[PDB]
Amino acid sequence: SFGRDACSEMSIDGLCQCAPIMSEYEIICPANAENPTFRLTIQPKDYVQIMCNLTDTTDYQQLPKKLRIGEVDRVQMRRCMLPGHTPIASILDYLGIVSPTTLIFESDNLGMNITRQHLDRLHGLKRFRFTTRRLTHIPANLLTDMRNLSHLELRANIEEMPSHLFDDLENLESIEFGSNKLRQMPRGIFGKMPKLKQLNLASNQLKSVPDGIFDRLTSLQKIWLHTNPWDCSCPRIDYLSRWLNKNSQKEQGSAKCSGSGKPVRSIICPTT
Ligand SMILES: *[C@@H]1O[C@H](CO)[C@@H](O)[C@H](O)[C@H]1NC(C)=O
Ligand SMILES: *[C@@H]1O[C@H](CO)[C@@H](O)[C@H](O)[C@H]1NC(C)=O
C-alpha cells in the first residue's frame, strides 16, 4: 500500500515528485515538468485519479515505477490514451492498483478505436464509465466477461448499438446511454436484465423503439426517454405510448412527440 513513506522516497530519485496534500497524495510525472505527462491523485484504499497529457502512447514510460498503491475502489482516468493493443488494466497493474470496483475512462485523445482487449482483466469491475467526444463505433464483444458489472455509462456520440452488447451481463442495475446520437435500439438488447433498475436513453436521436423492448425489465424503477424525436404516429408509437402510460411512475421526465410536443404517454393508438 502507498503511504507517506512511499511518497517521501519518490522525491529523492527525481523521476516523479509526490506531495502529501490534505489526506491524499499528488504525484507529478515527470517531476520538475511545467506540463507533466501524468498528474496522479492518490487517496489510499479509496480513490486514484490519473490526469494525462500524452502526445503518444510511448509516454506511458513516464509513469511511476515499482509503485504499489494496492487495493483502491474508484479509478479515474482523464485525457489518457488507450495503451495501444494492451488492456487499460496494464496501467493499473504498472501502478499496483488491485481489484478496482469503479473505472472512469474519459478522454478525447484515445488515439484509436476502443476494443474488447482494452477492457480485458477487468471482469471484477462493478462500475464502468467511458466518455469521449470523438465519433466512436462500439463492437458487440467490448463488454464481454464484464459479468460483475452493475453500472454502465457510455457517452461517446454512438449512432448504432450492437445487439449482443449486454450478452451475459445479468448483474447490470444501471445503464446511462444519455446524450449519444443513437437512432435505433436492437429488438433483444434488454433480454436478460433481471437486476436493471435504472435506464437512461435521453438526449439521443430515437424516433422509435421495437415493440416489447422493456417487457423483460421486471426490476426497472426509473427510465429516461425524454429529448428524443419520438414518431408519435399510430400504430408505430402504440407499445411505447401504452408502456409509458402503464409505467408512468417509472418515467423520469417526459418523452415528447416530434411535431406536437405532447407527452408520448398521453397518445392513445386505435386498433385496425
Ligand atoms: C500538454 O502538454 C503540452 C506540451 O506537450 C503543453 O503545450 C500543454 O499546455 C499541456 N496541456 C495541459 C492541459 O497541461
Ligand atoms: C473506428 O472504426 C470505424 C469502423 O468500424 C471507422 O469508420 C472509424 O474511422 C474508426 N475510428 C477511428 C478514430 O479511426
Author numbering: 28 to 299
What is written in the article reporting this PDB entry?
Here a counter-diffusion method was used to improve the X-ray diffraction quality of the N-terminal domain of Drosophila melanogaster Toll receptor crystals.
Upon structure determination using a combination of single-wavelength anomalous dispersion of the iodinated species and molecular replacement the atomic structure of the protein could be analysed and the crystal contacts revealed. The atomic structures were determined for both native and derivative forms at 2.4 and 3.0 Å, respectively. The derivative crystals diffracted to a much lower resolution (3.0 Å for the best data set) than the native ones (best at 2.4 Å). According to their respective solvent content of 62 and 59% for the native and derivative crystals, the latter were expected to diffract better. Either incomplete substitution or the additional handling during back-soaking was detrimental to the quality of the derivative crystals. Surprisingly native and derivative crystals were found to belong to different space groups even though they had similar bipyramidal morphologies. However, I3C binding at the concave side of each protein, interacting with charged residues of the leucine-rich repeat region, modifies the packing of the second molecule by tilting it along its long axis by approximately 40° compared to the native structure. This in turn increases the crystal symmetry. The fact that the protein crystallized in two different space groups suggests that the Liesegang-like phenomenon is independent of crystal packing.
